[PDB]
């Protein structure tokens, strides 16, 4: 009995995709509904769309764009072709919206059903799908991210806390640099970190949910995971007590570091994935590490929440599509019996 269930859902090569095209620069998974691969045959570019409900029937079509990201739910796709961005309805075969930027967009992502986040060299913008609005600048980038490869952009549930992540390879290390912006205080904070996520968490006795910020880093102090409340507790709330635990990197994982995080709000657990393909499971309330193992021989370069199970799904460099979820019937028993932590297990039970 293990606290989690692992599973290979797909091998992309068996869906007809060339290994050259299975990578961060050409393959996106903005939700667990779709995977999008930008392929190039001769001098014709194509997008292959894989509906995760009907994997065996790919929508492979010729297109002129350097970058493609599927809406989290709708059959709507955004395409970047130079400095020109377009939002396209696939089933209507029609253009909804277009915009031409001044600066190149080096990174972009859907943060909701309606909004595309646009990252330039200098700034972050949010572009609304509905209406006529042009991209709106939210904040200017901080010097500490200059020259970084941008790997992620995250928001809390209310869109009041915004987080940009960049990394940089140096001789003896990968530097992690984050910028956390408060939409209400109108101020940013530079932070050293490699992977992060927000979560809603209900403390017992409180009037409202707390908004939590969780981030992992492999820095000067070794592997660390921090869980802190962001913002002012509402009337009726006590504050969440800051946690600070370890991320263990074995000796044989010398160059390893964190790359992805998703958080289960059904179970209040943190899923953490590293560059080498290890997963770690932590309790959100206490910061206790429940579990750790190696799930992939190759880098998992993109993840999303597995929404039906409150788990994590990802894609690796070999084209394996993998997921990890909580085993709902075994996690309490495993904490009680294998971990020998009846206090944590009661607390999880009790909070259920």
């Amino acid at each position: 009995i293990l606290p989690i269930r692992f599973q290979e859902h797909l091998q992309l090569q068996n869906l007809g995709i060339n290994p050259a095209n299975i990578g961060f620069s050409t393959l996106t998974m903005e939700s667990d509904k779709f995977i999008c691969i930008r392929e190039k045959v001769g001098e014709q570019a194509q997008v292959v769309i894989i509906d995760m409900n009907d994997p065996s029937n790919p929508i492979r079509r010729p297109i002129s764009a350097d970058s493609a990201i599927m809406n989290p739910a709708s059959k709507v796709i955004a395409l970047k072709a130079g400095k020109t961005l377009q939002i396209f309805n696939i089933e209507m075969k029609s253009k909804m919206k277009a915009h031409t930027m001044t600066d190149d967009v080096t990174f972009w992502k859907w943060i909701s059903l309606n909004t595309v986040a646009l990252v330039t060299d200098n700034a972050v913008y949010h572009w609304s799908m509905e209406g006529e609005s042009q991209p709106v600048k939210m904040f200017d980038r901080h010097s500490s991210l200059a020259g970084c490869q941008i790997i992620n952009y995250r928001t809390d549930a209310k869109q009041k806390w915004l987080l940009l992540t960049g990394i940089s390879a140096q001789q003896n290390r990968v530097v992690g640099a984050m910028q956390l912006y408060s939409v209400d205080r109108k101020v940013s904070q530079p932070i050293e970190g490699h992977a992060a996520s927000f979560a809603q968490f209900k403390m017992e006795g409180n009037a409202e949910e707390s908004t939590l910020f969780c981030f992992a880093v492999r820095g000067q102090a070794g592997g660390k995971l921090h869980i802190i409340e962001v913002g002012t507790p509402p009337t009726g709330n006590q504050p969440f007590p800051k946690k600070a635990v370890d991320v263990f990197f074995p000796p044989e994982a010398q160059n390893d570091f964190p790359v992805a995080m998703q958080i289960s709000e059904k179970h209040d657990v943190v899923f953490l994935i590293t560059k080498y393909g290890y997963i770690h499971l932590y309790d959100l309330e206490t910061g206790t590490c429940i579990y750790m193992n190696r799930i992939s021989g190759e880098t998992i370069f993109v993840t999303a929440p597995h929404e039906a199970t409150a788990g994590i799904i990802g894609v690796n460099r070999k084209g394996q599509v993998l997921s990890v979820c909580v085993e709902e019937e075994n996690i309490i028993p495993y904490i009680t019996n294998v971990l020998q932590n009846p206090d944590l297990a009661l607390r999880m039970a009790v909070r259920n």
Binding site: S25, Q149, I167, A169
Partner: peptide, 7 residues
């Protein structure tokens, strides 16, 4: 130049 997933 080298994308991060290949580091």
């Amino acid at each position: 130049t080298l994308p991060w997933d290949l580091w």
